[PDB]
Amino acid sequence: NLDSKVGGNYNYLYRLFRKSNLKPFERDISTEIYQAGSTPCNGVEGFNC
Amino acid sequence: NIDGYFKIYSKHTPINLVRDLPQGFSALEPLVDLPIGINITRFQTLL
Numbered sequence: 001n002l003d004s005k006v007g008g009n010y011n012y013l014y015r016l017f018r019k020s021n022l023k024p025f026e027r028d029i030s031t032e033i034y035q036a037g038s039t040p041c042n043g044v045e046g047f048n049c
Numbered sequence: 050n051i052d053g054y055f056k057i058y059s060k061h062t063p064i065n066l067v068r069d070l071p072q073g074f075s076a077l078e079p080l081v082d083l084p085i086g087i088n089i090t091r092f093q094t095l096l
């Protein structure tokens with residue numbers, strides 16, 4: 001009733017990629033681009049970035 | 050830094066020496082526990 005919107009509420013986020021699992025009570029707010037492939041991203045989002 | 054908690058133990062004592070830390074024994078009681086939850090891999094002093 002509070003967090004949903006007819007057009008879709010996207011204000012809540014979740015981390016989808018990370019090089020390793022979190023240790024207990026760890027907090028990670030980084031926004032570094034994750035390179036899922038062999039091509040360096042250089043801070044540019046895209047395929048495998 | 051254990052489970053995101055930063056433990057800082059401290060101790061002080063007067064000394065009279067100018068070469069290195071004097072030989073002796075003392076205990077460092079805990080003074081601060083901080084709920085940072087922050088990754089740590091480096092530090093640097095400031096003087």
Ligand SMILES: *[C@@H]1O[C@H](CO)[C@@H](O[C@@H]2O[C@H](CO)[C@@H](O)[C@H](O)[C@H]2NC(C)=O)[C@H](O)[C@H]1NC(C)=O
Nearest residue numbers: 019020021022023024026028087088089090091
């Ligand atoms: C905290 O951050 C450090 C980065 O400084 C992480 O250590 C890195 O882990 C990756 C995993 O593949 C390695 O490739 C790097 O060489 C590591 N760097 C160093 C300096 O160790 C560490 O895993 C992070 N830990 C937490 C709990 O977030």
